[PDB]
Write a protein that binds this ligand. Structure first.
Ligand code: AXS
Length: 211
């Protein structure tokens, strides 16, 4: 096992093959301990889950400080936080996976290259290298800074994202809200008038597929 695993891939290969809560260490630094939910089953596992939507019990209409730091319940609905995502994606080349499920249908999207800038970039999104079945809805968002109501689409649509003008993805939107662009949307799968029941965003090293 690796004493201070810096993501859910290093934490898995230690043998641990159950999805659940695990401790990771940013830059492998024992002083930068982070609790994450590892999805160890989806496409060979080793994923840090950074968003989960599944029942609308948690409020995602939260401020910049809340999106930077993280919020909610890692076992249920949560946001891991942008400072975390910046530090994780700085450790090497990460891939993004999005898993969607709504009234029994499933779709996914993988981006070979995924990173989040530091606070000085307003946590700039980078997503390149699409494959999957949900449709390339993040390409629209590539290069966008993060937006919350207090730093305008977040206020217009009552959510938070790497907004442009405004979104094809709104996975931190209002739960079960089918009003145009207000819900948990992945436009190129279910459009802007269908709020998705279940959504996870997760990352692991892009080189995991053949490590
Ligand atoms: F994924 C996440 C990441 C962060 C959080 C909020 N952390 C709260 C701090 C202060 C009191 C306890 O920890 C929730 C879910």
């Amino acid at each position: 096992s690796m004493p201070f695993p810096k993501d859910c891939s290093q934490a898995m290969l230690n043998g641990d093959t159950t999805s659940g809560l695990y401790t990771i260490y940013l830059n492998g630094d024992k002083a930068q301990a982070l609790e994450v939910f590892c999805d160890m089953t989806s496409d060979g596992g080793g994923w840090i889950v950074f968003l989960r939507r599944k029942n609308g019990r948690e409020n995602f209409y939260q401020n910049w400080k809340a999106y930077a730091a993280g919020f909610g319940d890692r076992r249920e609905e949560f946001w891991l936080g942008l400072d975390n995502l910046n530090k994780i994606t700085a450790q090497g080349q990460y891939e993004l996976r999005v898993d969607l499920r709504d009234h029994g249908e499933t779709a996914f999207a993988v981006y070979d290259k995924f990173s989040v800038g530091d606070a000085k970039t307003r946590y700039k999104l980078k997503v390149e290298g699409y494959s999957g079945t949900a449709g390339d809805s993040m390409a629209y968002h590539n290069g966008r800074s993060f937006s919350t109501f207090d730093k305008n689409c977040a206020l217009s649509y009552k959510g938070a994202f790497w907004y442009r003008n405004c979104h094809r993805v709104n996975l931190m939107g209002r739960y079960g809200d089918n009003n145009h662009s207000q819900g948990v949307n992945w436009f190129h799968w279910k459009g802007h008038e269908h709020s998705i029941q279940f959504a996870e965003m997760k990352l692991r090293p892009s080189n995991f597929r053949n490590l």
